[PDB]
Design a protein around this ligand. Structure first.
Ligand code: ATP
Ligand code: ATP
Ligand code: ATP
Ligand code: ATP
Lengths: 449, 449
């Protein structure tokens, strides 16, 4: 970790022209200008995000070397400091897949029956990046008029056929478009198809020879195990920001309530193999939400748990020493309680950091500037709210839209002169990064309104 | 009364796992975060209720165990911290009954002849829950046309009859629908009258057998004393939040002016039996209000007196040491005097408290958040203003509406972690409850505008 004075003096000696390094070290002087974060929050006002700025630094790297690696919980790590919020208006299994493919995570909302949430988790854990998730397969006992309508029900129309479930051939639109006819098309006589477990490059080369649209994957027992459709192999992108677990399949989380009736919901989700739980609660520091934490850590010692909403170091203490591995730092964005967001994030992050429990800055983030700030104050990850609602993956497109935010954060953390979010926060806690307040007159000019 | 550190450490030892109780007591450490109330008002910015928040605490009880018992004056106590304001657009005998049935009190306005206010008090003191207050009795000498029109005057039409006023029979629409006679209607024959005063639950059984619409209440003198109507027995609710005096009938108050002409108004109201007087005045600390106070305490030593409006500890001193038993803490919510309401409530409550003289936070309260605040700052009761105008009791129904505010206050004082308003204030004065300021940027984002 090199100070801006160390970076300038070293890189100036790399460019080329004594008792300067020997009389003040690599700290070759810089003017003190603006406030350190510890001073900015000392006046005890409710500084929100619109209210402060980050004074620019020294730049010695390009805007595409700003490592974004962030930490979600004590053991889960992410390539992107973003998250989708556990709301019915935002996250379901489609957006949970989309976020994980962009190096983040998503949390499945809990405004549903417990079985539905476990099904939506299962739907994410089994994604495979080119195979069809949960293929529809039909029985020869069923009349093809009740396969022809499925095109009116699900929209797709090339259906594989077998005795009841995941062998005979396929029925597709070209078997039906000239005609109710019981079922009388394509026995087990398909062309070149995947005989066992296969790769996506191998399927791309087989589909090129075969020219057909569906490709079964069968097993050694010579029955269907998965299926491919050509239309997806035409488009499936590279995703280096993978967000995969130790079994090389997507990370995803689930929200759970804190009620007595929720040990059952938490079972079904842990049987679906969910990676992390967020305890959804308007105020996390309650006796029965601490009982819920002690209960999870006693029964499923592998499951990561993120504590419910807090905004003080006293709440953060009681949830941490209960054993939680994260924290949603956000509340009050009519109520009579809460805290101004910017002060909440700074105070909880600075407290949690003493043990290593990264936090999650949820609430009232609505620009990429607010994201860069929340990350400079101490938040480890920012939970995108209704900002993602009315994108086409919500119950623009998330896959095309997340790169915009990434490039914006990278440009920001480049103007600040911090080559990786971990360094941004180190540069903040050590007082090397400087901040300035704003009068209302100075934000009505150049922003806000 | 136990602190968040005492409650967490004790309740953790109820669940189970040393020289940690023996080296710092039940105060097992919590982070200092936010301002105590004494610090919040030290800056001498005049705050109002929109300017601060209450940092959330530790929760260990349900939102329905938040005892709301508050103290109106040194001797009158209320089950609910609400009041209806003494305004013509708000309080009259109907709303005064409605507030007392919801565990609060109401103060009858004084924009009237003194006789009218004494009548509206008399109407409130004599309520009796099931019985008709002030029944209409007609004379056997009246022609039916002057009874039949009363249905056009008062709307009801089952009129009991006797010589002039509070039985010799009844007359109802069924006696009159076919017709003008002068007397042909039901003479004394009535199906199980109440022979004396009776329990409302006994009358509920009598109406079930009798099937008639009216039930006379009579006396051993063989004459009327009260009457019951069947339609009210179908709907009378439980009211456990009673607000009743030692004589087991409703509490109510009256506003009086401070003029020389008002010893007469104060007589008529004290003859009607009013429980508490509020001295209405734009500024309470005047020689002729202190004369009015000394005068009441010299002539009616039983009557509770609430001092007219103040906003400083210097005003509060002069009225307290005059002998008043309460205080409307509110002024100026264009006139060149006054105070920002949040600072007024805190300063007057903190001063009065030295003697035990609870105050009443009147002015500019327009949400349930502001109510929870005014109660956290020191106000003992909050006087609902034009917030209650355009309800059906205003000269959408107060009986149905007050439970909303109650549940809201209870949810608030649950998030704050204080099991009973008396504990909320104890937790504030002892500096355990922490507050935060809010820049305009922090309330332009999180509600309010
Ligand atoms: N067996 C299947 N079960 C469920 N969905 C399927 C199946 N086969 C294809 N799909 C859906 O179709 C998408 C891509 O294939 P495509 O749309 O070309 O199917 P298709 O059957 O060939 O459609 P169509 O016959 O109308 O042209 C997949 O991403 C998936 O959403
Ligand atoms: N892997 C396969 N091997 C052999 N024949 C196949 C295979 N997959 C599909 N078929 C058959 O080949 C024909 C074309 O099917 P295809 O996969 O192209 O779907 P389709 O409905 O015809 O697609 P599209 O509507 O876009 O033209 C159909 O008779 C179908 O049953
Ligand atoms: N004798 C009465 N004197 C005064 N008020 C009365 C009297 N009888 C009824 N009321 C008023 O009328 C309300 C409804 O009473 P009730 O339903 O018995 O009316 P009613 O006599 O049957 O009228 P109607 O014959 O027109 O239906 C009561 O709550 C009360 O406010
Ligand atoms: N307590 C009573 N005992 C005996 N007769 C009564 C009594 N009260 C009313 N009546 C008579 O019984 C008849 C019906 O009276 P009731 O009170 O049921 O009519 P109402 O409810 O006022 O009229 P409506 O049915 O239109 O609302 C009338 O002749 C009335 O004078």
């Amino acid at each position: 970790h090199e100070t801006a004075a160390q970076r300038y003096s070293a890189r100036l000696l790399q460019a080329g022209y004594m008792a300067d390094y020997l009389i003040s070290g690599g700290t070759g002087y810089v003017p003190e200008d603006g406030l350190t974060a510890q001073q900015l929050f000392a006046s005890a006002d409710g500084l929100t995000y619109n209210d402060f700025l980050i004074l620019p630094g020294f730049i010695d790297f390009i805007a595409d070397e700003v490592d974004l690696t962030s930490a979600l919980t004590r053991k889960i790590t992410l390539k992107t400091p973003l998250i989708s919020s556990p709301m019915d208006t935002v996250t379901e299994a489609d957006m949970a897949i989309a976020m994980a493919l962009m190096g983040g995570i998503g949390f499945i909302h809990h405004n549903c029956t417990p079985e539905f949430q476990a099904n939506e988790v299962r739907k994410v854990k089994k994604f495979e990046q080119g195979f069809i998730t949960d293929p529809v397969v039909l029985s020869p006992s069923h009349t093809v008029g009740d396969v022809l309508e499925a095109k009116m029900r699900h929209g797709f129309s090339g259906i594989p056929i077998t005795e009841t479930g995941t062998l005979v051939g396929i029925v597709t639109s070209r078997d039906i478009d000239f005609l109710l006819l019981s079922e009388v098309m394509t026995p087990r006589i398909e062309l070149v198809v995947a005989p066992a477990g296969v790769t996506l490059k191998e399927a791309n080369e087989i589909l090129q020879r075969s020219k057909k649209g569906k490709l079964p994957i069968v097993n050694d027992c010579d029955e269907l195990v998965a299926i491919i459709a050509r239309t997806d192999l035409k488009k499936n992108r590279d995703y280096p920001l993978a967000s995969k677990d130790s079994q090389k399949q997507l990370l995803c989380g689930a929200a759970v309530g804190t009620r007595e009736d929720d040990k059952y919901r938490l079972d079904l989700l842990t049987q679906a193999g969910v990676d992390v739980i967020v305890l959804d609660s308007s105020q996390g520091n309650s006796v029965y939400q601490i009982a819920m934490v002690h209960y999870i850590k006693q029964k499923y010692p592998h499951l990561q748990v993120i504590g419910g909403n807090v905004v003080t170091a006293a709440q953060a203490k009681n949830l941490i020493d209960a054993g939680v591995d994260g924290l949603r730092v956000g509340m009050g964005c009519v109520m009579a309680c809460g805290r101004p967001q910017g002060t909440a994030v700074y105070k909880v992050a600075e407290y949690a950091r003493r043990f290593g429990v990264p936090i999650i800055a949820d609430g009232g983030i609505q620009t990429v500037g607010h994201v860069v700030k929340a990350l400079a104050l101490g938040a480890s990850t920012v939970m995108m709210g209704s900002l993602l609602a009315a994108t086409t993956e919500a119950p623009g497109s998330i896959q095309k839209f997340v790169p915009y935010l990434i490039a914006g954060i990278q440009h920001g953390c480049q103007d600040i002169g911090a080559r990786s979010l971990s360094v941004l926060r180190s540069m903040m806690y050590s007082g090397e990064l400087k901040f300035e307040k704003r009068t209302m007159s100075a934000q009505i000019e150049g922003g806000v309104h």
